[PDB]
Design a protein around this ligand. Structure first.
Ligand SMILES: [Mg+2]
Ligand SMILES: [Mg+2]
Ligand SMILES: [Mg+2]
Ligand SMILES: [Mg+2]
Ligand SMILES: [Mg+2]
Ligand SMILES: [Mg+2]
Ligand SMILES: [Mg+2]
Ligand SMILES: [Mg+2]
Ligand SMILES: [Mg+2]
Ligand SMILES: [Mg+2]
Ligand SMILES: [Mg+2]
Ligand SMILES: [Mg+2]
Ligand SMILES: [Mg+2]
Ligand SMILES: [Mg+2]
Ligand SMILES: [Mg+2]
Ligand SMILES: [Mg+2]
Ligand SMILES: [Mg+2]
Ligand SMILES: [Mg+2]
Ligand SMILES: [Mg+2]
Ligand SMILES: [Mg+2]
Ligand SMILES: [Mg+2]
Ligand SMILES: [Mg+2]
Ligand SMILES: [Mg+2]
Ligand SMILES: [Mg+2]
Ligand SMILES: [Mg+2]
Ligand SMILES: [Mg+2]
Ligand SMILES: [Mg+2]
Ligand SMILES: [Mg+2]
Ligand SMILES: [Mg+2]
Ligand SMILES: [Mg+2]
Ligand SMILES: [Mg+2]
Ligand SMILES: [Mg+2]
Ligand SMILES: [Mg+2]
Ligand SMILES: [Mg+2]
Ligand SMILES: [Mg+2]
Ligand SMILES: [Mg+2]
Ligand SMILES: [Mg+2]
Ligand SMILES: [Mg+2]
Ligand SMILES: [Mg+2]
Ligand SMILES: [Mg+2]
Ligand SMILES: [Mg+2]
Ligand SMILES: [Mg+2]
Ligand SMILES: [Mg+2]
Ligand SMILES: [Mg+2]
Ligand SMILES: [Mg+2]
Ligand SMILES: [Mg+2]
Ligand SMILES: [Mg+2]
Ligand SMILES: [Mg+2]
Ligand SMILES: [Mg+2]
Ligand SMILES: [Mg+2]
Ligand SMILES: [Mg+2]
Ligand SMILES: [Mg+2]
Ligand SMILES: [Mg+2]
Ligand SMILES: [Mg+2]
Ligand SMILES: [Mg+2]
Ligand SMILES: [Mg+2]
Ligand SMILES: [Mg+2]
Ligand SMILES: [Mg+2]
Ligand SMILES: [Mg+2]
Ligand SMILES: [Mg+2]
Ligand SMILES: [Mg+2]
Ligand SMILES: [Mg+2]
Ligand SMILES: [Mg+2]
Ligand SMILES: [Mg+2]
Ligand SMILES: [Mg+2]
Ligand SMILES: [Mg+2]
Ligand SMILES: [Mg+2]
Ligand SMILES: [Mg+2]
Ligand SMILES: [Mg+2]
Ligand SMILES: [Mg+2]
Ligand SMILES: [Mg+2]
Ligand SMILES: [Mg+2]
Ligand SMILES: [Mg+2]
Ligand SMILES: [Mg+2]
Ligand SMILES: [Mg+2]
Ligand SMILES: [Mg+2]
Ligand SMILES: [Mg+2]
Ligand SMILES: [Mg+2]
Ligand SMILES: [Mg+2]
Ligand SMILES: [Mg+2]
Ligand SMILES: [Mg+2]
Ligand SMILES: [Mg+2]
Ligand SMILES: [Mg+2]
Ligand SMILES: [Mg+2]
Ligand SMILES: [Mg+2]
Ligand SMILES: [Mg+2]
Ligand SMILES: [Mg+2]
Ligand SMILES: [Mg+2]
Ligand SMILES: [Mg+2]
Ligand SMILES: [Mg+2]
Ligand SMILES: [Mg+2]
Ligand SMILES: [Mg+2]
Ligand SMILES: [Mg+2]
Ligand SMILES: [Mg+2]
Ligand SMILES: [Mg+2]
Ligand SMILES: [Mg+2]
Ligand SMILES: [Mg+2]
Ligand SMILES: [Mg+2]
Ligand SMILES: [Mg+2]
Ligand SMILES: [Mg+2]
Lengths: 148, 185, 234, 51, 157
RNA sequence: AGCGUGCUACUUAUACUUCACCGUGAUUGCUGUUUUGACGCUUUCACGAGUAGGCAGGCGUGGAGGUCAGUGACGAAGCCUU
RNA sequence: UUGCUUAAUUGAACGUGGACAAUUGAAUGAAGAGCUUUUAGUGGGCCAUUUUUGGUAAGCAGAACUGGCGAUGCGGGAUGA
RNA sequence: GCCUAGACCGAGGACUGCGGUUUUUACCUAGGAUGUUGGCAUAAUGAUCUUAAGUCGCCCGUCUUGAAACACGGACCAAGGAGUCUAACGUCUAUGCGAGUGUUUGGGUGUAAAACCCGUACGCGUAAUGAAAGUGAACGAAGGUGGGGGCCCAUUAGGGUGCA
RNA sequence: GCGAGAGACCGAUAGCGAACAAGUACAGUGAUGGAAAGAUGAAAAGAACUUUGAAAAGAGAGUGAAAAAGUACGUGAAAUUGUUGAAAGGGAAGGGCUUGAGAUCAGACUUGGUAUUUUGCAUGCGGUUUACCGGGCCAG
């Protein structure tokens, strides 16, 4: 609402809060990102270091679909197990019958190894796993099954 | 005339009331304004101040934070007090039986507390079974984990997060972030 | 029928108040005897010290000697200069003396630290050695205490007891005695005392204030003439 | 509600200082000092008159 | 004025006054005000008249008579602050003023027969004592006024 | 009624002292008498200059939802007027 | 305790355990101390005392510290930042 | 210690306090003015307007170190007349839900641009780092030390637990 | 362009330049440029007639709810102006503060209580004046 703006409170004061010497002018200092190496260096160097220059090699025609690989950690891995059957799986899982967790069908490409698993066998199907993620899965009696 | 040794006509700088106009939060302030004024219990004076806090000053308390506080020695049967929202944590492997008083519970939080044999009560229910906050334990959420705090106090060699819209190799990584491009700060 | 309800409540609470006041007055009678005895003892020791000093002077005169008075241990400092155009160091010194207005008075125990303080504020204050009657009149007419950072009139000995009983000050005369013969709790008693807010002199100042008392002005040490100055201003 | 000067209001003076009553009763404000009529300056203190 | 309605908490009851501790004490009169003193009236109808002071009433007023035959000033009350107390005095020990008080001069043209009788009885003794001092009756029958060069701060009365 | 100097009294600033009132900041207490206002009432103390500028609390205007079963041709709005 | 140091069982740093209690180690003051975020205007200055440079000097130009004017009314200096 | 002249003020509004005099749970000058009398109610009293008198008072706005300036605009009056809207954002605050969140592109529906209902994707968040190939977050009760509000046991003090 | 329905939009210096005989009047050789300008009243009932005047008009009169609505048209501000009344005024005027003077305004004999006198009405209601209680204001 306009009735809440400070333009309404500056009515009656000559300069409208802009100052009498400095005044409000068209574009003192330039337009946009002007002067970034000469008189706005002190701003860009302090608050946006790394702005000027090239780093790394180009990549012509980069298709971001190639690099699609959402991550899931181990402390969130049992959330892909059916909610209505999680407690049963946590009890009756053994080497002979362990729950299967299809991570790709839930939208994940790589299993990472943050956190701790229940000491319960699981079958994890993944496109990729980390070295430590697979070591933690085997310790609880599980296995990693590679898929594509 | 006076030679003023301090600034004149200075407000305290602390909230004396909620900024919120929610009438039901006001009723809670009504109750603990009376309790803090009359019990000499330090718990009630803390609760009254905490009811004034803004949303960022009452960060959410995960159900995992409560579990670690109940795992303190001799704190297993204390009443957990959260002036704010209690959220769920799907990274927990197990939750104990506990009594928790909070402003709000999430669907997962209310389910989990009651699933494990506990209680999920409001802060007015606390004031009857513990009008002095006896055998309680106040839990506060992490304040410095907010995303806005990443950019606070940014400067050369400060290690804070730049205020930037896109992230990548072409975005503020060359000159001033690299000795091969001049200097590094 | 609320008339008879409120009348019954008033008479019941009046009776309870009467009994409690009877007990309170009986207990306070002993305290008032204590402060009476204290005041009488203070008067006796004042007189004894005066007569002792007089006798020592007479004896030294008789015995071909010279009695040198003990240097004064107490001083009363009045800020007689306005609040404009004061250099930072004397300004800070005057602020630390709680002299933040013209005609504000404070009690200072003379040592070296406080003497060098007053020397820094000397061009802006008139100070001197206050007599017992001057202290009494100041405390009686313009005596205020700092209670919860508020300036409260010293209209009852209960205020003084409630604020200085841990320092063995139970009366206005205990406070005056503690000030005059500079006592072990001078610091607490003088800081509890709000800075005295005096009027201008009846009869005016000298023709020009802001020059030393020695040169015909008003600043600096005027000593026993601080009593006349206080008599003018209080 | 209204500060009263104990130097003007006698009741307030007695409220603050009960010994003022004895001071009035004993005439402490005009008490005599008992001593002999002596003059101990007859000797060397006459160095004040001349040198 | 505006459209602001009275609220329920806006009470109309009138509080009682606090208990006042202004216990009245008797009037102090000037040492020059002694019964029998000749007074000068400064204000009122009988301004400038020299009159005899008789009694101090309980109204803080002074009972005064001319006497009426000499002056035309009857028995009445005056205020002590509208009076010059001279140094001339008349012996009024032989004048009975017992019956005179505030209720005598109560407000109810004409004049009471009692008042006329009292006027004559008082004036008889007043005249008897006045005759002893020569020119005192003439002095009382003459009005007072300030002449040119009269300084009341320097005159003795 | 000039110059140097001393003395007595006297003159008056929005300054100082006491007091009234306004506002700001703090403060005492207020639910078995909280009692149809607790965003409220109450006790006490200190303070109050201000361009550029910030903020707060308010006054007024066109139009909109709701409400006053509001005013009004027995006179709305507008306009003039110690 | 150590992977450092010493010829060393020497030291260095960080420690366990024990002793020293309100005169717990000067004064004075303290409308309390500490902390964070965000943003306005400004970025022509000038003056007085004192220190002071160039210049014959300047109501000139330039510095140091403080206080002021600017941004400020009120009493005095008739008048005057 | 005592006597004495004048001026200004009267805030508060049942009681509650501290004292004094105590002849007495009597009275008082002791937590803020009462008593009495006269006059007036066709009015004494108060306010405003106009005007006289006394005293002070330069033309506003602006740029400026400095303006009443011999600096600029303004003869007068009425009406109009200048920090807006939008895309994308920072801080702070309120609200809903919360490891998720966002119905509105679209579909359903409708008393039809409203309201009501639906869901796949997608955006942001839930992982970072490296130029990249790539790799990818528990020694320990998710660590130790000194503080730390609150809480627990105590009994000045003291001990335990100690979120942010 | 054609045909419709709408709006937290503007309300005759606004809204399109144009609500009207508006791309009109008018300018420029020309390309082009380009206004101002809505409102009597329900109804002309748009003032017959008489009279003065050369006439426009005026004065009577008439219509009308209104002529304080006459096409100079509802309402009719200010600048500016006439008349009447009041005041002030020695090379400006105007202002603040204060009081005087004049004018204007305000307010307690209250919803005053007690009975009387004394009268209009539907045993009772309001008024009035005399007594007492007490109150308001200005003062001693
Ligand atoms: Mg403002
Ligand atoms: Mg402003
Ligand atoms: Mg301004
Ligand atoms: Mg302007
Ligand atoms: Mg301005
Ligand atoms: Mg601004
Ligand atoms: Mg400008
Ligand atoms: Mg600028
Ligand atoms: Mg360059
Ligand atoms: Mg993509
Ligand atoms: Mg002030
Ligand atoms: Mg983070
Ligand atoms: Mg973290
Ligand atoms: Mg001091
Ligand atoms: Mg004098
Ligand atoms: Mg003098
Ligand atoms: Mg003198
Ligand atoms: Mg002088
Ligand atoms: Mg002089
Ligand atoms: Mg005095
Ligand atoms: Mg005669
Ligand atoms: Mg002269
Ligand atoms: Mg001379
Ligand atoms: Mg002289
Ligand atoms: Mg003198
Ligand atoms: Mg003032
Ligand atoms: Mg006043
Ligand atoms: Mg408060
Ligand atoms: Mg309210
Ligand atoms: Mg201000
Ligand atoms: Mg509006
Ligand atoms: Mg509009
Ligand atoms: Mg509306
Ligand atoms: Mg006018
Ligand atoms: Mg140790
Ligand atoms: Mg020392
Ligand atoms: Mg900053
Ligand atoms: Mg800034
Ligand atoms: Mg800044
Ligand atoms: Mg800035
Ligand atoms: Mg800027
Ligand atoms: Mg310049
Ligand atoms: Mg500039
Ligand atoms: Mg000098
Ligand atoms: Mg000097
Ligand atoms: Mg210069
Ligand atoms: Mg200066
Ligand atoms: Mg400037
Ligand atoms: Mg100044
Ligand atoms: Mg002046
Ligand atoms: Mg001047
Ligand atoms: Mg001069
Ligand atoms: Mg009063
Ligand atoms: Mg009795
Ligand atoms: Mg009293
Ligand atoms: Mg004038
Ligand atoms: Mg002048
Ligand atoms: Mg300009
Ligand atoms: Mg210039
Ligand atoms: Mg100007
Ligand atoms: Mg010139
Ligand atoms: Mg000029
Ligand atoms: Mg210029
Ligand atoms: Mg020119
Ligand atoms: Mg120009
Ligand atoms: Mg000009
Ligand atoms: Mg011009
Ligand atoms: Mg306008
Ligand atoms: Mg999603
Ligand atoms: Mg929709
Ligand atoms: Mg439609
Ligand atoms: Mg990558
Ligand atoms: Mg690399
Ligand atoms: Mg169409
Ligand atoms: Mg069309
Ligand atoms: Mg349609
Ligand atoms: Mg138009
Ligand atoms: Mg019309
Ligand atoms: Mg028209
Ligand atoms: Mg029509
Ligand atoms: Mg029609
Ligand atoms: Mg005609
Ligand atoms: Mg005609
Ligand atoms: Mg006609
Ligand atoms: Mg008709
Ligand atoms: Mg009409
Ligand atoms: Mg009209
Ligand atoms: Mg009309
Ligand atoms: Mg016209
Ligand atoms: Mg009309
Ligand atoms: Mg018209
Ligand atoms: Mg006009
Ligand atoms: Mg004339
Ligand atoms: Mg002339
Ligand atoms: Mg002329
Ligand atoms: Mg002039
Ligand atoms: Mg003039
Ligand atoms: Mg006037
Ligand atoms: Mg008048
Ligand atoms: Mg009176």
């Amino acid at each position: 609402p306009t009735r809440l703006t400070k333009t309404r409170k500056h009515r009656g004061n000559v300069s409208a809060g802009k100052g009498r010497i400095g005044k409000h002018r068209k574009h003192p200092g330039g337009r946009g990102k002007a002067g970034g190496q000469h008189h706005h260096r002190t701003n860009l160097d302090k608050y946006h270091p790394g702005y000027f220059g090239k780093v790394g090699m180009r990549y012509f025609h980069k298709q971001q679909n190639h690099f699609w690989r959402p991550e899931i950690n181990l402390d969130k891995l049992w959330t892909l197990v059916d909610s209505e059957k999680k407690d049963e799986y946590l009890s009756k899982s053994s080497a002979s019958a362990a729950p299967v967790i299809d991570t790709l069908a839930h939208g994940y490409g790589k299993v990472l190894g943050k956190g701790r698993l229940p000491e319960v066998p699981v079958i994890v199907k993944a496109r990729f796993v980390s070295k430590l993620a697979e070591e933690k899965i085997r310790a609880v009696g599980g296995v990693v099954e590679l898929v594509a | 005339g006076r030679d003023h040794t301090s600034k004149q006509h200075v407000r305290s700088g602390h909230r004396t009331a909620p900024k919120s106009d929610n009438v039901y939060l006001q009723l809670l302030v009504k109750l603990y304004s009376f309790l803090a004024r009359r019990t000499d219990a330090p718990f009630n004076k803390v609760i009254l101040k905490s009811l004034f806090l803004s949303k960022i000053n009452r960060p959410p308390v995960s159900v995992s934070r409560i579990s670690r506080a109940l795992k303190q020695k001799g704190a297993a049967e204390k009443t957990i007090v959260v002036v704010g929202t209690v959220t769920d944590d799907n990274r927990l492997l197990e939750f104990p039986k506990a009594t928790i008083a909070a402003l709000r519970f999430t669907a997962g939080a209310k389910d989990r507390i009651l699933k494990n044999g506990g209680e999920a009560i409001t802060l007015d229910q606390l004031a009857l079974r513990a009008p002095k906050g006896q055998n309680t334990l106040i839990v506060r959420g992490p304040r410095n984990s907010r995303e806005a705090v990443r950019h606070f106090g940014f400067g050369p060699h400060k290690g804070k997060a730049p205020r930037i819209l896109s992230k990548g190799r072409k975005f503020e990584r060359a000159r001033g972030r690299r000795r091969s491009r001049g200097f590094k700060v | 029928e609320t008339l008879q309800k409120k009348e019954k409540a008033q008479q019941k609470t009046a009776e309870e108040r009467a009994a409690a006041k009877k007990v309170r007055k009986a207990a306070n009678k002993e305290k008032r005897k204590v402060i009476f005895d204290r005041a009488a003892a203070y008067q006796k020791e004042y007189t004894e010290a005066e007569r002792s000093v007089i006798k020592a002077k007479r004896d030294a005169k008789a015995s071909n000697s010279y009695y040198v008075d003990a240097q004064p241990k107490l001083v009363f400092v009045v800020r007689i200069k306005g609040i404009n155009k004061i250099p930072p160091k004397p300004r800070k010194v005057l602020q630390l003396l709680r002299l933040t207005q013209i005609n504000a008075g404070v009690f200072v125990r003379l040592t070296k630290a406080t003497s060098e303080l007053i020397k820094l504020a000397e061009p802006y204050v008139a100070y001197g050695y206050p007599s017992l009657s001057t202290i009494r009149q100041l405390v009686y007419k313009r005596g205020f205490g700092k209670v919860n950072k508020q300036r409260i009139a010293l209209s009852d000995n209960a205020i003084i007891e409630a604020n200085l009983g841990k320092f063995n000050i139970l009366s206005i005369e205990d406070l005056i005695h503690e000030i005059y013969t500079v006592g072990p709790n001078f610091k607490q008693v003088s800081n509890f005392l709000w800075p005295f807010k005096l009027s201008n002199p009846n009869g005016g100042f000298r023709a020009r204030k802001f020059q030393h008392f020695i040169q015909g002005g008003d600043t600096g040490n005027r000593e026993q003439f601080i009593n006349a100055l206080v008599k003018q201003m209080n | 509600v209204l500060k009263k000067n104990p130097l003007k209001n006698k009741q307030v003076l007695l409220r603050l200082n009960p010994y003022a009553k004895a001071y009035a009763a004993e005439k402490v404000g005009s008490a005599k000092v008992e001593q002999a009529k002596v003059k101990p300056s007859k000797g060397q203190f006459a160095e004040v008159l001349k040198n | 004025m505006s459209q602001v309605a009275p609220k329920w908490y806006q009470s109309e009851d009138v509080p009682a006054p606090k208990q006042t501790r202004k216990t009245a004490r008797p009037q102090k009169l000037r040492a020059s005000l002694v019964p029998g003193t000749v007074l000068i009236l400064l204000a009122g109808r009988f301004r400038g008249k020299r009159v005899v002071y008789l009694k101090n009433l309980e109204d803080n007023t002074l009972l005064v008579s001319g006497p009426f035959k000499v002056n035309g000033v009857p028995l009445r009350r005056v205020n002590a602050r509208y009076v010059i107390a001279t140094s001339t005095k008349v012996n009024v020990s032989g004048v009975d003023v017992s019956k005179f008080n505030v209720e005598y001069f109560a407000r109810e043209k004409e004049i009471k027969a009692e008042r006329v009788a009292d006027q004559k009885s008082v004036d008889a003794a007043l005249l008897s004592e006045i005759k002893k001092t020569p020119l005192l009756k003439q002095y009382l029958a003459a009005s007072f006024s300030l002449k040119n060069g009269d300084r009341p701060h320097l005159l003795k009365f």
